[PDB]
């Protein structure tokens, strides 16, 4: 079978050279990849990502899972069965602090989770974990609050 | 602030006992805890205010799929006053959906823990999934590796 | 082959209980298990010399865990590879560093050859907050900052 | 106090650029880092010539191939950590004959976070290679690729 592994952090966590790092390891051992977002292919429904895999593929590569469509999680599932491993790197919540659906739902299957933090753009540390509006800045929990 | 772990996997997965591990490291730094099952047994998550007071520095819940997702904002408040929160919870049904309560907290998570069983059809420490077979040896639930599943399931 | 997962923390960090968590789950699972500690699967055979444990470890036993392993000779470390290299897996519980902040060598060469590494933190003893990585001094967990205070 | 993370595992489980995604997210958010092997990035001989690079300025350290450095680099990070700088080291874990690599085991005993990275290994190829194997050059395999190769 595949393995799911999902990097998830807030904005600025560097979540999309984390995801790039594993594609990197993968065309090192030269095994066959397909990179998705939403030298990747750009799609708008996850049914579309069948069409640049071939029997050959070994690593499925998706970044900004959480503006795909939930539909993401039967197809990843898919994938992990036919024993591709898949990779996706997404928001876990919004600005607002709520979920991300397509993440949490790739969450809830991931056989790994990788939590990335960023900077705090008020304080400074290497702790900030959520996402803030006004632009976007990522903050930490503290920071968070008393920014609004 | 707090922080929040999330302990998750399948059934038989050892995720009770982990939260415990979390549970004494408090206890022994004479920390004042809070710990609920669906240990305070509540039916709803607005019922573990009336058990946490102003020094409890901990809060521990099981089985965290049975309760309704207003969860995700009872620890979100948790968090902001500075309490620690560990949940455990299974992360998918035997039928491979994701229990939404499980899901929302793994979003909010600080920090999240994937436990593995062992297959109880090919004997490897890698079970991942739970599935439901007859059970007239020992329906009944069974931890199994994805490969394993497919092949029963 | 085999895959090693170490556990490492201050004391007070909850490693035992990590490790038990281990065990139990094997258990569940019907795999045999051997149990072992150093002298300083329900039995937890307490044994001097790491080279003790093929004594107690059968064809088909399928895990091995090992507690306090800072106490154990370095030689350990050969015998968990040999331990990997047919099948089993292997599970250590130790401190990483002594009370002055110097590595605890047998625990060092285990984290090295570790699949999996799991760090634990203990609740500060000056400080109240989960955040300890350090062990002082009676001993006493305490974080970076608090161990700096103190001495 | 400063934080350290260890990044380990065989050639080609994609440790240096693993450090580097620390830089990136660090430089980005604004903060002073000083980066050596044996921004600013410096090569240098001795741990002990980090010193003269650190300004009261610094909050992140990096330092790859940590395997060839002097053991002696256990105490440098500490005092970096002790002085509020966070501290991210990657190296190798193993020698080609799995004999630990000092220097890393004791940054790895040092460390609060510790990252174990994989390869695709080189002979069956699977996302599941811990081990580097001299063939002369060096592959990444699985431990039973290694015994099956020796
Ligand atoms: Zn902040
Ligand atoms: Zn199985
Ligand atoms: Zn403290
Ligand atoms: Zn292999």
């Given at each position: ?9 807030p904005m ?8 790039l790092s ?9 095994k066959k ?5 939403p ?6 429904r ?29 197809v ?5 069965d ?13 600005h ?31 702790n ?21």
């Amino acid at each position: 079978s595949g393995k799911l592994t999902v990097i998830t952090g807030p904005m600025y966590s560097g979540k999309t050279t984390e995801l790039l790092s594993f594609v990197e390891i993968y065309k090192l051992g030269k095994k066959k990849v397909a990179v998705f977002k939403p030298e990747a292919h750009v799609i708008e429904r996850p049914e579309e990502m069948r069409k640049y895999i071939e029997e050959d593929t070994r690593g499925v590569f998706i970044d900004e899972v959480q503006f795909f469509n939930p539909s993401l999680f039967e197809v990843v599932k898919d994938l992990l069965d036919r024993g591709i491993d898949v990779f996706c790197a997404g928001l876990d919540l919004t600005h607002k602090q709520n979920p991300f659906e397509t993440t949490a739902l790739l969450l809830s299957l991931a056989d790994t989770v990788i939590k990335k933090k960023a900077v705090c753009h008020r304080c400074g540390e290497y702790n900030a974990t959520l996402t803030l509006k006004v632009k976007y800045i990522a903050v930490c929990r503290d920071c968070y609050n008393t920014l609004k």
